[PDB]
Amino acid sequence: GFKQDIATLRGDLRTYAQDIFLAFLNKYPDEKRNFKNYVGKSDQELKSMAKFGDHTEKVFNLMMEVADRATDCVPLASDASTLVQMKQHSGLTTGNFEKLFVALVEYMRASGQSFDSQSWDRFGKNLVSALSSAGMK
Amino acid sequence: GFKQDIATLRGDLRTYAQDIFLAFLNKYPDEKRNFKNYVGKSDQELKSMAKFGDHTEKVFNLMMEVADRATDCVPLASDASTLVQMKQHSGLTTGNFEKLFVALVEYMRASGQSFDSQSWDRFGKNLVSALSSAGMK
Numbered sequence: 001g002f003k004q005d006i007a008t009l010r011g012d013l014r015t016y017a018q019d020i021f022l023a024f025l026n027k028y029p030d031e032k033r034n035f036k037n038y039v040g041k042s043d044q045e046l047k048s049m050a051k052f053g054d055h056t057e058k059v060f061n062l063m064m065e066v067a068d069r070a071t072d073c074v075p076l077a078s079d080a081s082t083l084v085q086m087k088q089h090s091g092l093t094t095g096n097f098e099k100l101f102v103a104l105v106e107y108m109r110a111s112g113q114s115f116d117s118q119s120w121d122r123f124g125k126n127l128v129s130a131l132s133s134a135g136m137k
Numbered sequence: 138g139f140k141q142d143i144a145t146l147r148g149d150l151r152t153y154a155q156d157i158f159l160a161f162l163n164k165y166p167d168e169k170r171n172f173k174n175y176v177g178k179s180d181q182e183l184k185s186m187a188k189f190g191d192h193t194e195k196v197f198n199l200m201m202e203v204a205d206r207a208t209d210c211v212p213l214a215s216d217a218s219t220l221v222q223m224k225q226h227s228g229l230t231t232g233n234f235e236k237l238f239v240a241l242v243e244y245m246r247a248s249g250q251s252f253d254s255q256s257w258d259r260f261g262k263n264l265v266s267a268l269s270s271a272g273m274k
């Protein structure tokens with residue numbers, strides 16, 4: 001279930017974070033404008049940049065903290081507020097996050113492993129609604 | 138305290154994992170008997186070896202999960218048994234683990250941060266006790 005999936009992801013966090021983020025960027029090419037240092041580069045070129053692996057892992061580490069503090073796949077309002085108020089998120093709307101979670105669930109369903117894809121779909125939808133309640137447009 | 142320290146380490150885990158493992162290898166040079174590929178290499182050279190970085194991060198990913206599952210710095214018996222039974226740990230003894238935790242605690246005390254170094258000292262001692270209970274020599 002959802003708690004075991006957090007343990008599966010954390011055990012190899014660097015690899016899962018890179019592969020899910022690449023799946024997102026390739027599914028939604030217009031989303032790459034939030035990341036100007038990544039434009040015009042193949043997947044393997046991206047993986048050779050120190051900050052691509054480091055920052056992508058740090059994003060997924062915070063995602064796993066929020067997931068583990070959730071109740072029945074509903075995140076804490078305080079965690080949603082942190083994501084709204086981060087200076088690095090100043091340009092964003094809930095649609096950016098909606099798309100990330102569509103790509104994450106698609107990756108889990110295609111992987112050939114027993115992820116609880118339905119719980120991750122709920123988590124993404126409940127995170128989007130919490131972001132709106134915490135003040136994201 | 139201990140729970141916040143797990144969050145701090147997870148926020149920059151590859152960097153902390155490599156720096157603590159180097160501290161261990163440099164404090165106890167005879168411990169390289171179990172790491173023959175790491176002989177004859179300076180710290181900067183080890184940090185550009187793919188397996189050194191990838192394996193060290195995976196070790197610390199699992200260490201943080203064992204710490205997070207503990208109660209009052211006492212690990213689960215199921216986590217201790219996993220660590221005894223892993224094929225990659227055949228022929229380790231509890232002294233290998235004792236020395237890794239001495240180095241980890243020394244690193245925290247020298248860091249200039251606010252780590253709860255006494256809780257990590259207790260965790261290392263309690264993990265050693267649990268590994269003995271689960272059958273490590």
Ligand code: HEM
Pocket residue numbers: 031034035054055058059060062063088089092096097100
């Ligand atoms: C639950 C989902 C998300 C979490 C937990 C999260 C978390 C983070 C964290 C921890 C950082 C700092 C990384 C660092 O400096 O090392 C970061 C930076 C950033 N985030 Fe997010 N974020 C999420 C979703 C998104 C989405 C959907 C976008 C845009 C599509 C986005 C855009 C950015 C940008 C532009 C930065 C700064 C640039 C960079 O680090 O390279 N975030 N985020």
Ligand code: HEM
Pocket residue numbers: 168171172191192193195196197199200203225226229233234237
């Ligand atoms: C709580 C402490 C520890 C945890 C959580 C842990 C976990 C792990 C994990 C997850 C791996 C697999 C790495 C991979 O294949 O990518 C591994 C391999 C290994 N472990 Fe540990 N371990 C710990 C302590 C130690 C200690 C103290 C030693 C020896 C001083 C050690 C020696 C090894 C060896 C020799 C391998 C295989 C060779 C290699 O990966 O280069 N372990 N361990």
Ligand SMILES: c1ccc2[nH]ncc2c1
Pocket residue numbers: 021052055056057059
């Ligand atoms: C969201 C997901 C993965 C990432 N890597 N770098 C910035 C970033 C934002």
Ligand SMILES: c1ccc2[nH]ncc2c1
Pocket residue numbers: 158189192193194196
């Ligand atoms: C213990 C700590 C760090 C490590 N890196 N690779 C194997 C290993 C064992």
